Nucleic acid binder design. Structure first.
Ligand SMILES: [Mg+2]
Ligand SMILES: [Mg+2]
Ligand SMILES: [Mg+2]
Ligand SMILES: [Mg+2]
Ligand SMILES: [Mg+2]
Ligand SMILES: [Mg+2]
Ligand SMILES: [Mg+2]
Ligand SMILES: [Mg+2]
Ligand SMILES: [Mg+2]
Ligand SMILES: [Mg+2]
Ligand SMILES: [Mg+2]
Ligand SMILES: [Mg+2]
Ligand SMILES: [Mg+2]
Ligand SMILES: [Mg+2]
Ligand SMILES: [Mg+2]
Ligand SMILES: [Mg+2]
Lengths: 60, 144, 67, 185, 260
RNA sequence: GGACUUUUACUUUGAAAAAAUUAGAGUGUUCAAAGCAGGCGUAUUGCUCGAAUAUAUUAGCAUGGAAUAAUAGAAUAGGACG
RNA sequence: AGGAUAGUGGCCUACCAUGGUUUCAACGGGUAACGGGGAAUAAGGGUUCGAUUCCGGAGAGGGAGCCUGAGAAACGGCUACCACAUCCAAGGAAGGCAGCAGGCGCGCAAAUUACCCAAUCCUAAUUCAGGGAGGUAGUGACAAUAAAUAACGAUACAGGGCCCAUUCGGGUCUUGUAAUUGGAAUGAGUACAAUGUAAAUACCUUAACGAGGAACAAUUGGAGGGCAAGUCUGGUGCCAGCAGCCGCGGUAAUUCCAGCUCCAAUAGCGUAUAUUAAAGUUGUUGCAGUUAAAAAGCUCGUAGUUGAACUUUGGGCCCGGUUGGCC
């Protein structure tokens, strides 16, 4: 109900965020190949199992 | 017992009682009264086009503090005036005044969403271009 | 490959019992040079406006043009 | 107007999208059998649910019922013919014990892998898709072909394929020409 | 609306014609003739769909316009001529004759007959009436009128037509213990013997029929067609003799035949 | 032909209740959705399986039953039987 | 009783009688109502949808009238009136796309002013003519089916294996990682040709060309919980924004904006609206009414609904079949 609500501030954060370009990385396989690598990453190559199975653990 | 008739020949009473008490449901009442056709900003439609009348800054409801950047628009097909929320960071600079927008609901079949008070619609497109495409920079707003 | 086949008795029975398109495919009969379907229909509709042969109005308009 | 065409869906999505207990089981099946996505499991689950429903609703009625006998024998015969159900354990109550793995191991990918010639299920799928396998004399490039227990002995490389013979291959020809040029002649 | 219909949409044609759903928006509408279109077989359907002597209606018309086909001794060049039950179709070439009888699955089956049987046919008496000048006559099921009939010929009897002159050569009364053929309802194609009949004044006389191997059923009198006595029919039966084996034992016979 | 009929509800069985759609039998459309095709000979000028089946309600029509529920009868006998 | 009709009938007329329907809901009003076969969902019972491929009805801008005809109250027939609209030399004359294609308008919302009678059928005096009926192609992410975006090869390796692995030493079958490094496989696409078709375009085949970043480069939506997936790193500091709901943001944000990574479905994924299950939150099955919403202040009372028991029970004799202890 604020008739004086400042509309001039729209887009502030998206305007002032530092523009960081996406890194160039090799393409990930698509389809059955992606299901293959997902299966290996989840059931064969079980890397991080701290406490229980962890699937997107950070550094340290 | 049970306060309702049970005899084999009481079907008329049971059917009429169910018909009468059916009017206490929300959806049945709306369907039978045709409220969407009669009293609804859209004519029962999912989307509607409008002409932006002005840009509004709506204060957020407690316990949130924000300006929600809505637009007051007038619908083409019936001339009703509604308020539509413009969803994203920015995207209010894409709307402008006197422009043509397309509106959908929020998803609560009426029932203003979240901390925005009394706003039941959101802008999908402006000047024939998707607002998501304008925000992702896939497209550009036409001059016309 | 799998297809269908017919063998007739002599040339004439084939040339009478076989469709024109297959005659044209095999070269036995030639293609008739007809106008397109739309202009054929338009010409038919044009002739619908004429009662009789048309020589009456033909010489009448010739008189109007050469008066 | 012409009579309408009939079509139906061959799969059904699960009621709960995000439950790990079957999400990982589905990924296990996909990795084991070289499947493209979860729809290939949903299709087999849909088919097996149809068959289990038929067997349940057809066992609920007593024996020597002409309905139960006719459709039970038909279902038993179809399952035995396709090979999802063995020669033994040939009964409707033994139908209810069937699992998705049975149809997955009756897939064309599975048999192509099992009888040599593939060395991997993923190699089997790309081999089938690349028109290198003939179930009889017929090239079959559909990995879910569902072999029917009488074409097993007849699976071999296609005669029109380089592995079947009579053709060296596109890349083989190109590099044979280049190697001959670099050698001389 | 506003007058008679001339088109017959496919999916509205009789199911016993066994027409493919695709390959055409329409079906051959039978012309007016001796039989109702619901229980008639058009010549184009018999020649193209049943006998495979033609590939399409154009070749059917080419066949008919050469006077090759004749129904009941007459050429009948009409493509959609309504040939029905008991009718005799003759092909001048191929030296064969056909009689239109349903198989037990309630559809006209390609049934070949000899010249002697093709010389005659049977008809069911629909009514016996006095015509003009006091001349009696009978009306058969195929829309045929025969003047001066036997006085003992009553309604729903069977008469034998010489098919070269429209004359009655013999007749069978409708009585218990006579071989009947079912021409309507769910019992199309059945051949059995009358047990008895229920009067039911006010409509729909009911007939009890016993099969050759003791399957008893009941049928409306309108679907009953007398064809002879207990044994020795007046018409050669089609392959099957109208018994209606159950699907299980049809399966068993099919498997015995296929697998030797 | 009448010296011929208490009236129902209810329930059984049966005739019919378009086709398509639905369920479902058979069939290697390369698989499948489909479709209603097809299959087998030595191809020496031909043999042959099919295109099933089920359900489709209420009302009407016949039809066996007479528990359950209603209805009627002989009380100023104007009653039954010949 | 007559008239009229093809014919029954207040269908109409003359005379007569005062009847006919209704709380078992007449009559009137509304329908964003054409009916049905059927569709979606669905333990059972149900709920919702059905303008639309088949059947039946109705209509051809709105009404009315009529001719011809077996059949029309026809409209790609006529006549009049109304509305709308076209040509004109101003005298007059000609119209009806809710057929096909196409245009304007309307809106959230829907395709070519293409080819052909070869198929299906239909009509005619008819084998032949005609058919925007119909078929063929064009557009087409409505929906549905199948399923390409890669598969095999070097050197550290948790040792899960064998001489008590006492030696990064050994056949330990090692799928499992490090821009490396090599051959092989192929259709997307191109087109000989043939086939396909009335002609064609495509599909099934097929001579050559067609892979190294196979750039021949998969997307959509998420990562607090419901609900699978991050105390990772920058930016912002109740701002911008997110968030179906609960909530997240006021200087260490797992929730915003981004990078990395991960998750889910995947040539599809999200959003809105409606509807179904979930909903025993419509209830017959099967709710609830002391206090959560809900026993009329009390009694009488018609319709409606529902209403104690009792009338031939019990016994014997025969005929005629079977998931069943020996021909
Ligand atoms: Mg019509
Ligand atoms: Mg009268
Ligand atoms: Mg009167
Ligand atoms: Mg309406
Ligand atoms: Mg409808
Ligand atoms: Mg009309
Ligand atoms: Mg006429
Ligand atoms: Mg018109
Ligand atoms: Mg018309
Ligand atoms: Mg149009
Ligand atoms: Mg059309
Ligand atoms: Mg993030
Ligand atoms: Mg989680
Ligand atoms: Mg209270
Ligand atoms: Mg009280
Ligand atoms: Mg009070």
């Amino acid at each position: 109900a604020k008739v004086h609500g400042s509309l001039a501030r729209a887009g502030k954060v998206k305007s002032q965020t530092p523009k960081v370009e996406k890194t160039e990385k090799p393409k990930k396989p698509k389809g059955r190949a992606y299901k293959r690598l997902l299966y290996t990453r989840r059931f064969v190559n079980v890397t991080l199992v701290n406490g229980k199975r962890r699937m997107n653990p950070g550094p340290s | 017992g049970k306060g309702k008739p049970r005899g084999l020949n009481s079907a008329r009473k049971l059917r009429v009682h169910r018909r009468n008490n059916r009017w206490a449901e929300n959806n049945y009442k709306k369907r039978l009264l045709g409220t969407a056709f009669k009293s609804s900003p859209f004519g029962g439609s999912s989307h509607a086009k409008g002409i932006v009348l002005e840009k509004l800054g709506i204060e957020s409801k407690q316990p949130n503090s924000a300006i929600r950047k809505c637009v007051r628009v007038q619908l083409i097909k019936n001339g009703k005036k509604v308020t539509a929320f413009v969803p994203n960071d920015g995207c209010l600079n894409f709307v402008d005044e006197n422009d043509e927008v397309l509106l959908a609901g929020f998803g609560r079949k009426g029932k203003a969403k979240g901390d925005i008070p009394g706003v039941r619609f959101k802008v999908v497109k402006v000047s024939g271009v998707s607002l998501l495409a304008l925000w992702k920079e896939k497209k550009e707003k036409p001059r016309s | 490959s799998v297809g269908f086949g017919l063998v007739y008795n002599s040339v004439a029975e084939a040339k009478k019992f076989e469709p024109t398109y297959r005659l044209v495919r095999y070269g036995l009969a030639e293609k008739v040079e007809k106008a397109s379907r739309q202009q054929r229909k338009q010409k038919k509709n044009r002739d619908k406006k004429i009662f009789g042969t048309g020589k009456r109005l033909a010489k009448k308009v010739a008189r109007r043009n050469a008066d | 107007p012409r009579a309408p065409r009939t079509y139906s869906k061959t799969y059904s999505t699960p009621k709960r999208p995000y439950e790990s207990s079957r999400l990982d089981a589905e990924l296990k099946l996909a990795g084991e059998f070289g499947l493209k996505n979860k729809k290939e499991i949903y299709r087999i689950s849909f088919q097996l649910s149809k068959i289990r429903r038929a067997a349940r609703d057809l066992l609920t009625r007593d024996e020597k019922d002409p309905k139960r006998l006719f459709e039970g024998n038909a279902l038993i015969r179809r399952l035995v013919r396709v090979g999802v159900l063995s020669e033994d354990k040939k009964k409707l109550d033994y139908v209810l014990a069937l699992k998705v793995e049975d149809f997955l191991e009756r897939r064309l990918q599975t048999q192509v892998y099992k009888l040599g010639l593939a060395k991997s299920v993923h190699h089997a799928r790309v081999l089938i898709t690349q028109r290198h396998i003939a179930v009889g004399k017929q090239i079959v490039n559909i990995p879910s072909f569902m072999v029917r227990l009488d074409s097993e002995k007849h699976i071999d490389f296609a005669p029109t394929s380089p592995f079947g013979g009579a053709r060296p291959g596109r890349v083989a020809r190109r590099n044979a020409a280049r190697k001959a040029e670099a050698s001389g002649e | 609306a506003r007058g008679p219909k001339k088109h017959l949409k496919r999916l509205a044609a009789p199911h016993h014609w066994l027409l493919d759903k695709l390959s055409g928006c329409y079906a051959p509408r039978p012309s007016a003739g001796p039989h109702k279109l619901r229980e008639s077989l058009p010549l184009i359907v018999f020649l193209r769909n049943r006998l495979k002597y033609a590939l399409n209606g154009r070749e059917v018309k080419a066949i008919l316009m050469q006077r090759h086909v004749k129904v009941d001794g007459k050429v009948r060049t009409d493509t959609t001529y309504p040939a029905g039950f008991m009718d005799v179709i003759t092909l001048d070439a191929t030296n064969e004759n056909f009689r239109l009888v349903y198989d037990v699955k309630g559809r006209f089956a390609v049934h070949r007959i000899t010249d002697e049987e093709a010389s005659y046919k049977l008809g069911k008496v629909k009514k016996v009436q006095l015509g003009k000048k006091g001349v009696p006559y009978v009306v058969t099921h195929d829309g045929r009128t025969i003047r001066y009939p036997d006085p003992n010929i009553k309604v729903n009897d069977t008469v034998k037509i010489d098919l070269a002159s429209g004359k009655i050569t013999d007749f069978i009364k409708f009585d218990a213990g006579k071989l009947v053929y079912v021409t309507g309802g769910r019992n199309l194609g059945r051949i059995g013997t009358i047990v008895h009949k229920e009067r039911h004044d006010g409509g729909f006389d009911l007939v009890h029929i016993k099969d050759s191997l003791d399957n008893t059923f009941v049928t409306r009198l309108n679907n009953v067609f007398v064809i002879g006595e207990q044994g020795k029919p007046y018409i050669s039966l089609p392959k099957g003799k109208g018994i209606k084996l159950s699907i299980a034992e049809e399966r068993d016979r099919r498997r015995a035949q296929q697998g030797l």
